[PDB]
Amino acid sequence: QIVDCWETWSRCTKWSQGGTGTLWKSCNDRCKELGRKRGQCEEKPSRCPLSKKAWTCICY
């Protein structure tokens, strides 16, 4: 949830952070940080430093 931006569904679910840093932990843990069950890559540029892509795992 905190800092995640990709283009392909498989990308935001496995990685996180533009350029791939060290705090990805997949969409699973990246959503566990907010106490959510799962996450789906939605087109939300509100959290995407790369607006050309605008794909990020939305925690549900």
Side-chain angles (χ1 to χ4, degrees):
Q1 193 70 330
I2 305 298
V3 188
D4 170 56
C5 191
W6 285 110
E7 202 189 278
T8 323
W9 182 281
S10 38
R11 242 72 75 183
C12 33
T13 37
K14 303 175 203 295
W15 301 279
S16 296
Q17 277 143 27
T20 318
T22 195
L23 196 59
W24 8 293
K25 293 152 134 288
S26 313
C27 186
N28 187 17
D29 204 83
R30 211 58 251 221
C31 273
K32 283 165 61 204
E33 69 170 320
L34 243 74
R36 290 298 190 123
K37 277 70 177 300
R38 69 193 322 223
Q40 302 284 90
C41 295
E42 293 284 312
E43 304 182 88
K44 311 299 169 194
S46 342
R47 274 202 299 95
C48 236
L50 302 169
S51 311
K52 292 302 204 309
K53 284 76 182 71
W55 273 60
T56 177
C57 232
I58 296 304
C59 303
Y60 290 103

